[PDB]
Ligand SMILES: c1ccc(-c2cc3c(Nc4ccncc4)ncnn3c2)cc1
């Protein structure tokens with residue numbers, strides 16, 4: 144059930160922590176022993192009403208192989224007066240993130256045809272979200288996961304209502320600015336930060352720079368300074384001239400400043416850099432190897 | 440200065456009990472000194488290559504500048520090796536939680552004006568100590584102002600004193616970059632603004648602009664007039680203290696020393712009684 148607020152008892156249970164940060168657990172399905180990732184946050188009773196409202200605002204969308212499947216939201220109550228707990232459950236991916244991938248690679252840079260393959264998977268996941276009228280809102284290397292089969296999946300802890308960004312005294316945080324499109328940043332020219340499905344495509348382009356260089360543009364900058372520069376700077380660029388013409392054009396394709404003039408997911412899926420991948424099979428293999436030697 | 444290599448494993452020295460809160464970077468635990476049972480707050484930060492120097496700095500500032508009754512005292516630092524090592528930053532445990540906590544657990548989410556005068560003064564004394572050492576806290580807010588079980592007031596978190604942007608609601612106008620302020624130039628008086636907002640938080644239960652999206656608050660703060668208390672009940676002194684913390688242009692905002700001489704801060708006759716009222720309120724919430 145994706146429209147309810149049940150107790151996780153008998154359906155899901157926690158086994159061990161992964162990282163402190165939201166707090167993420169390695170969990171399991173009780174009735175089938177299937178592994179799942181579970182985000183656990185403390186919520187007040189005032190916030191629980193807020194998430195009831197947001198469950199109403201949810202949009203439905205089927206499973207999709209480029210999205211880590213969102214299994215639903217649960218609440219594990221505590222004694223009267225104390226803060227309860229919100230669980231957000233999602234498919235488990237054991238090969239880590241794309242950021243881990245680029246860090247666990249010599250020179251902190253991926254091969255261009257790896258970037259092409261990964262970028263296309265992100266786009267296909269996003270096409271599925273956008274065609275069902277949902278913005279992802281947080282595309283970056285950290286939020287793109289590899290499975291133990293070189294499958295690339297977007298993190299979904301309920302992106303439709305953004306439940307993991309809306310409550311738990313972390314919702315008052317501005318967060319990391321490096322993957323933000325110009326239009327989501329309030330500034331002198333844009334007093335109301337509009338979010339659009341095309342915001343994801345800017346972040347997608349930033350994620351491509353991240354794969355290519357290990358870090359998003361302006362990573363050397365204090366985050367408040369970057370937030371100021373992003374709506375003001377011309378579109379960011381790859382530092383090195385080593386890259387193919389197709390790659391530069393794709394980056395330029397994503398990073399159109401004015402979102403009204405930025406292409407849709409469908410258009411970018413047809414971009415020659417994304418569309419024409421002759422070494423795809425070998426790349427899927429190459430990634431499998433990299434995941435395996437890392438595990439030893 | 441400290442070197443991360445020399446740091447010992449915490450085993451048999453400190454043990455973690457339970458997560459008690461968060462930091463700018465790192466989870467905060469109610470920890471325990473194994474040999475004596477004495478409590479300590481422990482900040483558990485994962486030592487990555489990117490955040491490796493940010494951690495080093497938080498140790499050094501906490502170590503050198505926490506020798507003042509209004510700064511939560513540095514105990515020591517430890518590393519618990521794993522290949523993603525954990526660093527344990529150990530300091531004085533403030534049992535009563537935060538100011539934000541206090542107001543939200545008080546009836547009608549507001550504190551008596553003389554609780555606010557005492558608490559704000561303690562904040563200002565800790566701040567004066569930092570400023571005279573040429574340190575700017577940079578993240579003063581109710582969540583970083585703590586209370587011990589004895590109603591003592593202590594400043595924590597030198598995290599942003601030296602990649603994520605935190606909450607904006609307590610930021611001074613001058614730390615927010617914009618066209619006529621492209622480099623976000625600011626001084627020690629940034630903290631005094633934040634102290635004003637913290638006082639408003641004690642008075643109303645939330646900072647100004649709390650109903651706004653944080654990104655929208657970031658845009659508004661440099662454009663909006665100084666925030667004002669909603670109610671007309673407060674004294675003339677309190678209004679004037681808030682006005683003084685919240686001078687829009689930091690160039691003519693009073694210094695920490697000047698605000699300590701503000702009658703609202705300076706003249707506290709019921710101080711003795713306030714500490715008792717506060718102590719009681721902490722006990723009735725436990
Ligand atoms: C209930 C909730 C939180 C506390 C608490 C948090 C801290 C703390 N937190 C931080 C320390 C350093 N940096 C950020 C936070 N430091 C020192 N004591 N303490 C007590 C107590 C009761």
Ligand code: NA
Nearest residue numbers: 507508510512
């Ligand atoms: Na001290």
